[PDB]
Amino acid sequence: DNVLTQSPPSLAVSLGQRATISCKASQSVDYNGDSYLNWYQQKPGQPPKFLIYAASNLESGIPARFSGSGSGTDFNLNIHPVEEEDAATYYCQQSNEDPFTFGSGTKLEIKRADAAPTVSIFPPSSEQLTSGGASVVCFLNNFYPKDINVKWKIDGSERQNGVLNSWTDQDSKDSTYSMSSTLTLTKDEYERHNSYTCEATHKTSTSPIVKSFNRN
Amino acid sequence: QIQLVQSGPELRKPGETVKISCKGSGYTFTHYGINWVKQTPSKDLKWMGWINTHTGEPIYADDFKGRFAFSLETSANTAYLQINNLNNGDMGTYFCTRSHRFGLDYWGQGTSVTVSSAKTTPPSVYPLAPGSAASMVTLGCLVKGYFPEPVTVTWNSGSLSSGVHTFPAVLQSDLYTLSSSVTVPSSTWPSETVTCNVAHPASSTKVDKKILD
Amino acid sequence: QIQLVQSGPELRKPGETVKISCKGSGYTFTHYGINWVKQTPSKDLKWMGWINTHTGEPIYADDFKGRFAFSLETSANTAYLQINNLNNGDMGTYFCTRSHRFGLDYWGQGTSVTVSSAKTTPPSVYPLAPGSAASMVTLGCLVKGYFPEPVTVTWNSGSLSSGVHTFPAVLQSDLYTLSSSVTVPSSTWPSETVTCNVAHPASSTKVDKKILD
């Protein structure tokens, strides 16, 4: 088959700068004056979006900050100026032969100025308590860079077990990241202690960011 | 105003069959081919073949020859993909796309297929209200202990969305857990109603949870 | 999914009255104030005042004291602006906006008011097809000899829009003329139907013109 190799697998570009993504085909995609090579943009949770066809032709409705070049086996997608909405995976695709093939994609990450997280702690709800479980939830929202560390404290002592963390994809509007940290206990274990702390370090603060409540 | 709309997420046990629809609107359905594309869990995109919507003739990619069938119900302006004798390797998201001279222009939203012998479990949905001693306020919903993915979460039936962060689910002990936050001015909560709308298609559950102080 | 939707363009003779509605949805209407803003022909923005939607009490800007009245029909989730004894200086676009602690957050789409003693004239709508001897093709519609502004133009009822250029109208001899182009692949026309949809609210006219070779 016509194997499409993309490079790099991922890259980080500062807002306003140029992203250059390469697609190399193992067979020429040239037929009758045209290169049968297309570019798509995909954001997580969404279908691919048709950006560029025949190597260099912009699909109607697509911003002209996207541009493609190449012929034969060697193609590039250029994005300038890189914007917040441009965080996505980009895929090339050939239609010169059966089967159509896609590259494995290049993930574009956006670099921006520091942003401090907003940190929120939430006690177990009455409803979950009546069920016999106790989850304590901490949100750490809209920060940059992605580098963060979260500690749970129960009555001043660090708790590692029963913690599950989740992260959002880079935000399409402010290019920040968000994190959720959930500490799950049995109700019995939960009622044996009084103070619960979500403690975070992010580079935007000289001290840890502390959010706590008392079960009282 | 042209769109391709696919059927919802599907869960099957190994060996069973799934049939997925793709409905085109805003253009003459029998004038454009429909291509089928698989996205694997690792996010690779694989072209499965296409169906001529005028003749009804399917062409299958060599990788999708055997258990895959493209069909039509043109009176519904709909194309179907059927997968027979499901195995774990068939897990992923399936997309219909409209043929363009060079590319694939309009895409359906994707239909995920999960293959599992596990039982469906509905989520428990809990309000996340600020503690009693806590200009912007953050609220949330905890959506706990379900199977399979996905669930869908909105806030105020779509009225709140820019201030929302819905986090990827985590698997622990064969059950999924997800949380969603929403950040609004203190002028909107608690004076106005804020509700999370949670849906789990696999268990046929729809739950609205008002966030109360 | 919160929106404010206003009533359509209005034409009046001097001395007459206009009443304009603003309907809020997706939130509790009586919990937020409605402000009224005039945009002049020269594009200046003027705040006219506001109405408390809970008490019904209006406050008028000094520039809008006399012939302007804010009212409510809360059972319709609607606020009204009435302008009495219209003069040429009242011409412009009127916007309702929802109160925010600092700003004005949600806006209606605008309602233009034209003041004229002229008679309404419907547009004539003509297809612009390429000459007989002419990979992308451009087509158009000529919308000729109407009064007043505005007209609205779409292509294929919304299915084509990214390839569209609808040009500002020109006034010649007390009548307006506008044109609209659409550019599509040759694979879409003439094999597929391309139609321009023209509306002139003042004359109550709606016309569909198929572009034919």
Binding site: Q94 | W50, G103 | S187
Partner: peptide
């Protein structure tokens, strides 16, 4: 329109 995309529309 377009039945077959790319090579298939030949």
């Amino acid at each position: 329109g377009v039945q077959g995309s790319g090579a298939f529309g030949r």
